[PDB]
Symmetry: C2
Subunit: 200 residues, 2 copies
Amino acid sequence: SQKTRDGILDAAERVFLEKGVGTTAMADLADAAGVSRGAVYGHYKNKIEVCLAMCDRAFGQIEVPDENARVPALDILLRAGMGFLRQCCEPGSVQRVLEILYLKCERSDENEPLLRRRELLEKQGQRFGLRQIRRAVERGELPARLDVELASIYLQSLWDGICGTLAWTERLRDDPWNRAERMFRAGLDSLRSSPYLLLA
Amino acid sequence: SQKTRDGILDAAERVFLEKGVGTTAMADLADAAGVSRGAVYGHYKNKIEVCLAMCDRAFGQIEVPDENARVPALDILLRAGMGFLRQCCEPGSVQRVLEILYLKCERSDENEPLLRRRELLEKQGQRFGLRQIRRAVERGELPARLDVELASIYLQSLWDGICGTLAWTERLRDDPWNRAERMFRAGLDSLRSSPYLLLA
């Protein structure tokens, strides 16, 4: 029975992608899903509910890197940034959801729980990076007296920057993935060997 | 008489900022402007017209760096990127206009001329950077066999990245301007001393 549960969520990704979350209604879900208006309701209370639930399934799909593997911390930092970026711009459920969440989700008071979930993602992330760079210095891989904070701001900016050039421009339409990786690596060097990122 | 011309444009920046360009109408301009509906019409045909005109005044306000000054080309590249970023996030007419143009301007077929103007800005810019980095290598300031294209993609990403952290987060709410400059400089080093940005 709960297999039909999948039917609405994947149903939903499209519905929400097709029209915004504020304008989409609970019947229209059952339509695209193929189910009866009651069925959908059975499993869920509100469309908002169906929505949080669709977002969870899709975060369980984000690959979790192994924070504790015998490699350089920056090797972990990069792999994740490269795995994750991939998922944002390849064509699975995760890329859908994020596009739903950021673009097709109004700032109403109703979408508060959506908004919160989102920021949770943003923070979970921003902090993960902050952990990796921290370790690198501690692990000797990067200059003690590296200005950690500004450093993240640097990496985090760079990411977002190329994120916006994949979607949406044709600048990395040719070989994208080895190239981004080059940019990321080159981003990581500057932490390593660049004066202006140390403190005081 | 044409001094009232200013009155509508500055009038406009607010009106368009207040409600989008698609929803704003030509009477409402005269309202905020203080002028009569006929006056506004006298100087301009369409609201779209008033709008292109508002955008021009505000691009004449973008500082043009001296492409031909006896300094390093990257000194020119940075100054401009630092002057210009400033104008996007300090509180003059230019910052208004851009916010109007990017956020509060629908993708309708009507706003085509607006859209075009915009991209013109984007291209004028992207090309300016491409000129500066080009020169640097030619001028010996950067590795011949530097992969020019990927390099810009790198700088252009980084910019956009910090642009999005000024607006909109509190991450550079403390000292922003010396810090961004640090990031930019550190961005420029990586072109200089980073393997992954050369070709072949």
